[PDB]
């Protein structure tokens, strides 16, 4: 059939992916959310995902100025990574955080469990000291549960982190594992922790006292993953001792993840992405005639 | 002292935290540490009134967009920040505006358009573009550079003034 | 570095049975690379590059739970994950100076 149009997976000699990379710099930024979905879905459907991740992650690490800026923005390469975490690890993240969130909402949120640790916002009836005790108690069991999920990590996600670990290592050999665990917590775990209902983990939004706690806990969990201390908010420094003692426990989990099975796409009319950007994929530079002849037959809807 | 709840929104990497830190701590943060949600407080005198500035530093990462409903619901004025070297962030302000109006259920919500990183030689959004967009919104426009601390106070001192006019 | 000896690196072929050189004598070291600040937490490694061609034939990451089997003088081996690695030394004094660096590198892991 016309399925040769889906042969965007063509790989050039001594390199790879000419059509996708050209389409990467041409497609407008507003569609990069949709673009990261169509490439991952197609390539994984043809058992070529690793070559897709190898090309996109390489372009991001060659273009970055410092290692501290890698995959911390909303670039196309960063959206492709977040989409892979979402589609291969949502089941993993759901069943890992659901029992913990059910323990905080039900059986904990009654005796005025409060995680308010900003003294400027502390209610007079509450105590800062016991509130800090609740934040670390909740943060510890959440952190321990993530480090202890090494065996239950999906293999597809384990390959994405290994690919990300190898791509960064070819320009930042020292502590290249840091960018893996940082982006993993920043763009996959913590967004679901802050907004469990929006992530589909919970049925309804947690009570307000718990939403404030999950927000502060994700800030503590992000500092642990970043291997950095709190230095901006003064009311977060009391947690630096807890954060510093959990630095290397996160790396052992990250090193485990970065070392060492889906359906097809649904009714993907890829022409729309292909034809509504058909002017400047040819200017940008050989094979465009082969697809230009393809859609000379197949008319754009 | 009357409290003014300021909220800083904008795309990721435009300088929301470097502008906020230059206001609070008066030093330029050279690192790139993406924020989930930060909070600060500062006492200042504007037009002769001593007041407290409650400041929220929000997340520019679109993964944390589910939090926007809460701080748009509690904030009084919003500092709309875009980098003058990123067209995408310049157009991203529209989607922050429309959600603020939708949550406030009002078309007159006090806010200020801020074009950060003016110290850079490679401008992508020139002054006339942002000035025309600001007139379209009906809000002021301030050019800032959190590196050299240009217009940092002016940007925050303009937003409260918009809040004052809205309260009268 | 915590140690720097000249020894040949051995691997264990389960079919072959026993340890064989992994083939060239190499210079083997144990060292730390710090997380962030130099005088702070770090990762510890064993690295051996052949003098034949200055290229790595073994790189291992040390653990707190690492088992270091000192079977004979001038022969030690260990197990990391699925593979088994070991070295034979040119002198027992070299086998001791290298064992001193592995013992102290584990004590600093934290
Ligand atoms: N040259 C220059 N760099 C700036 C300026 N403002 C911010 N930056 C740089 O922009 C990067 C990100 O700044 P940051 O304040 O973290 O941005 P953000 O808007 O908070 N991002 P996020 O939404 O994720 O929190 C850092 O490298 C910082 O040094 C500026 O005025 N000039
Ligand atoms: Mg920030
Ligand atoms: Zn460390």
Author numbering:
A (entry chain B): 1205 to 1464, 1477 to 1501, 1513 to 1528
B (entry chain C): 1 to 168
C (entry chain A): 13 to 34, 37 to 124
The authors write:
Sprouty-related, EVH1 domain-containing (SPRED) proteins negatively regulate RAS/mitogen-activated protein kinase (MAPK) signaling following growth factor stimulation. The NF1 tumor suppressor gene encodes the cytoplasmic protein neurofibromin that acts as a RAS-specific GTPase-activating protein (GAP) and promotes the conversion of the active guanosine triphosphate (RAS-GTP) form to the inactive guanosine diphosphate (RAS-GDP) form, thereby downregulating its biological activity. The EVH1 domain of SPRED1 interacts with NF1. In this study, we describe the structure of a ternary complex formed by the NF1(GRD) with the SPRED1 (EVH1 domain) and the active KRAS (GMPPNP bound).
